[PDB]
């Protein structure tokens, strides 16, 4: 019951899926062959982890996930990797030719040739659910598949499943690890298209994650492996309420009620703590107070922006591990008298708190230290519009000269689609200004 189906699109989506599903298996004690010795109920069950894992007669715990990419090289590694026995072959879908960082190829030219197959595979998962809650879609903004095909998928999912909840984990493009120049185009295009088809989207700035890995983990040159393992921890924190049962546990949908005041305003800012190496975490225990303080340090945000220069519409604290309400309340009280937390005048200023007793786990051979407690803050701040602003500006610089647009027109797109997508972004930025203005 209340099953969640994950869909990982493109290179970024797939590889992030790898990290998350590896992390999930470690959290639930699931072996790479799919076996779970602790699970006494054979064949099925109504346990909390069953929302993400289905069960077979042989006791194999199978991820409710679909991996999609327009080229095979990335998903092939999953087919031959450590967790190859974890996924049924039908869950791993590949094409021959990618979208070449072209939104048009991902949404039209190449994407249309595989979209029916993908939906069919998704339908096979949905039919195994007794009460499907919704979808979790993992993709990049800058890739042709992660942008183009995702938007096509989100559109089709709205048709096949109505208003069944769809959540995004989106990878915001950053120069440090980006290898494409047209990513602002693909980003604006996919954001405009999925906007009315997405209930909630967690953006992850690659530069923010890049910085955290360098600053807090002493990594000179962070790889995708470095970034993804950190990203998986945030994703785990966000989905922990769905996968674990607890007394102090607060469902994600309940947080979502506070996080989304208007349909278009559905981009929460995520902040995670503690991110610390084993060398620095040795003989140094980080309390509830300390990790809660770190949430309001901008250097720990998933997205680079300044909440101090914006206004809050919601603040959620998702704790996990050795954490009791008493310490949380004390920590919050201290913060509320020191930090620059400014709320809009039309919403309460309280902090919504959740606690999962299950302590954080780390991937073996990783950089993150094994901490007793961790916290992920999800806040709705107008400051996240800065991420739109930086991206929209890069868009305008190239489009004024119509740079690279011929690659899109050649694949069947029109200039009207670009301007329409940009105007939507303009309205979106304008929407974030309007919600911050005080009432009459």
């Amino acid at each position: 019951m209340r099953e969640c189906i994950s869909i990982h699109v493109g290179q970024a989506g797939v590889q992030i899926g790898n990290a998350c599903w590896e992390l999930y298996c470690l959290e639930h004690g699931i072996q790479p062959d799919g076996q779970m010795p602790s699970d006494k109920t054979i064949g099925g069950g109504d346990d909390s982890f069953n929302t993400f894992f289905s069960e077979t007669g042989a006791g194999k715990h199978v991820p409710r996930a679909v991996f999609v990419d327009l080229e095979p090289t990335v998903i092939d590694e999953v087919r031959t990797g450590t967790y190859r026995q974890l996924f049924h072959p039908e869950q791993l879908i590949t094409g021959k030719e990618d979208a070449a960082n072209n939104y048009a190829r991902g949404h039209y030219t190449i994407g249309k040739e595989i979209i029916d197959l993908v939906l069919d595979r998704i339908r096979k998962l949905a039919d195994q659910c007794t009460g499907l809650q919704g979808f979790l879609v993992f993709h990049s903004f800058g890739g042709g598949t992660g942008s183009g095909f995702t938007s096509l998928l989100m559109e089709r999912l709205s048709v096949d499943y109505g208003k069944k909840s769809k959540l995004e984990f989106s990878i915001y493009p950053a120069p440090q690890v980006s290898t494409a120049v047209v990513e602002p185009y693909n980003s604006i295009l996919t954001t405009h298209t999925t906007l009315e088809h997405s209930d909630c989207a967690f953006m992850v700035d690659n530069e923010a994650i890049y910085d955290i890995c360098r600053r807090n983990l002493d990594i000179e040159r962070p790889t995708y492996t470095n970034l993804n393992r950190l990203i998986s921890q945030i994703v785990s924190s966000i989905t922990a309420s769905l996968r674990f049962d607890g007394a102090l546990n607060v469902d994600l949908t309940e947080f979502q009620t506070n996080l989304v005041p208007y349909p278009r305003i559905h981009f929460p800012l995520a902040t995670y703590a503690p991110v610390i190496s084993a060398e620095k975490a040795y003989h140094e225990q980080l309390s509830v107070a300390e990790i809660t303080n770190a949430c309001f340090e901008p250097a720990n945000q998933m997205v680079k922006c300044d909440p101090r220069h914006g206004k809050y519409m919601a603040c959620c604290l998702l704790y996990r591990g050795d954490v009791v309400p008493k310490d949380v309340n004390a920590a919050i009280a201290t913060i509320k008298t020191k930090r620059s937390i400014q709320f809009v005048d039309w919403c309460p200023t309280g902090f919504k708190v959740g606690i999962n007793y299950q302590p954080p786990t780390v991937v073996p051979g990783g950089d993150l230290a094994k901490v007793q407690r961790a916290v992920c803050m999800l806040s709705n701040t107008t400051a996240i519009a800065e991420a739109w602003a930086r991206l929209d500006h890069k868009f305008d610089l190239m489009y004024a000269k119509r740079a690279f647009v011929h690659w899109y027109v050649g694949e069947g797109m029109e200039e009207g689609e670009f301007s329409e997508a940009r105007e939507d972004m303009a309205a979106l930025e304008k929407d974030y200004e309007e919600v911050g203005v005080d009432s009459v």
Partner: protein, 421 residues
């Protein structure tokens, strides 16, 4: 899974094509007999890009050798790595081109183009997912220029949704074979602008200057010039042939490098001719360019840099940021993050580490201005036009080719003077 079909036409095209397969076979551990005797599995992971796997674990180059005379192609079969090529892929004529573009594109070359296309189809249908094509040729000759551009047009018909790239060799009076080369070049460019996605301008004048001034060679031969071409071609194909952080085919490469369809003529670079800052600074040095153009006389639309060898990834990022800041004026502002960097662990033969440069600069107009200047100097007096009008051409077609290349120059100047505001 991502295959490339290689085509070489004319004297120049085959000789630089031969050297290309020699260098990359050495890097992939392929002997002239076609067997593999390397030491790394990274030499075979993307081996299918340029090689076919036949009976007996042989790696046969997916290459098609074309010419209108047996002369040059016979030297390939007898030279090193001669028995490695597929014998049926040898398509040669007899009558020759006589250094005439008209005979290459309209008369002689058109009588042989179908037999070449048959070999292309056979190679293309054996591909799981064909990326596209790469052509090595000269623009100042007859076969490589005339029939080379002819092949492009015919392939564009049968494979319009494939990438068409060329390694074109620009004619120079310093290494001039004839005197009618400005005509052949201009006519070739007139075709390249319309029917190619990427074109590498291997300028002979630049090659001669490097050998003479930098490599200290008083009497440079074609063997000396092609040594620079081989090293350059080996570098620009590195990320395609080797496993790395970059997962991109010809199409994805073109998307990041070509902001405007016509403006797709790149300035190759190489270093050295040793620390990462030094390697980076030399890579952007105008004396290390394979095109006789000063990048500080124009602005960069897009830049692709490739580092090879074991080095500090952190230091590479630091130096690439450092050069952009200190030289911001030479990078257009209306294209954010137009400089990309790739790194391969495997260095070229003989070097600890190297760097290959691919620049899309507006300063390449200097190369076209040079050709146009030599072109119009002959066309204004109707010199040697009987060679072309005798094959069926007219003066109108010459004027159109001249007008198209002059437009290309105006276009490069437009975006050079373009500003963000």
């Amino acid at each position: 899974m991502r295959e490339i079909v290689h085509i070489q036409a004319g004297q120049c095209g085959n000789q630089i094509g031969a050297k290309f397969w020699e260098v990359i076979s050495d890097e992939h551990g392929i002997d002239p007999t076609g067997s593999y005797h390397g030491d790394s599995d990274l030499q075979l992971e993307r081996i299918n890009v340029y090689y076919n796997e036949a009976t007996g674990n042989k790696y046969v180059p997916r290459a098609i050798l074309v010419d209108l005379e047996p002369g040059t192609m016979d030297s390939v079969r007898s030279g090193p790595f001669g028995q490695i090529f597929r014998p049926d892929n040898f398509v040669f004529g007899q009558s020759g081109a006589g250094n005439n573009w008209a005979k290459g594109h309209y008369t002689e070359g058109a009588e042989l183009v179908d037999s070449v296309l048959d070999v292309v189809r056979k190679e293309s249908e054996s591909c799981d997912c064909l990326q596209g094509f790469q052509l090595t040729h000269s623009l100042g000759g007859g076969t490589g220029s005339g029939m080379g551009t002819l092949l492009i047009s015919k392939i564009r018909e049968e494979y319009p949704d494939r990438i068409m790239n060329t390694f074109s060799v620009m004619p120079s009076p310093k290494v001039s074979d004839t005197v009618v080369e400005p005509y052949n070049a201009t006519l070739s460019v007139h075709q390249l602008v319309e029917n190619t996605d990427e074109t590498y301008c291997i300028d002979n004048e630049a090659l001669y200057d490097i050998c003479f001034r930098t490599l200290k060679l008083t009497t440079p031969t074609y063997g000396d010039l092609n040594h620079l071409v081989s090293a350059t071609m080996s570098g620009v194909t590195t990320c395609l042939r080797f496993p790395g952080q970059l997962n991109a085919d010809l199409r994805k490469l073109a998307v990041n490098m070509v902001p405007f369809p016509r403006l797709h003529f790149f300035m190759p670079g190489f270093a050295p001719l040793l620390t990462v800052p030094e390697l980076t600074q030399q890579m952007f040095d105008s004396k290390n360019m394979m095109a006789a153009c000063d990048p500080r006389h124009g602005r960069y639309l897009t830049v692709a840099a490739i580092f090879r060898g074991r080095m500090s990834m952190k230091e590479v990022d630091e130096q690439m940021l450092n050069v952009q800041n200190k030289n911001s004026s030479y990078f257009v502002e209306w294209i954010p993050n137009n400089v990309k960097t790739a790194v391969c662990d495997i260095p070229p033969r003989g070097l600890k580490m190297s760097a290959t440069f691919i620049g899309n600069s507006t300063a390449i107009q200097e190369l076209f201005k040079r050709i146009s200047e030599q072109f119009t100097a002959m066309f204004r007096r109707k010199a040697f036009l009987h060679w072309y009008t005798g094959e069926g051409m007219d003066e109108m077609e010459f004027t159109e080719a001249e007008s198209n290349m002059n437009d290309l120059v105006s276009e490069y100047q437009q975006y050079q003077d373009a500003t963000a505001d």
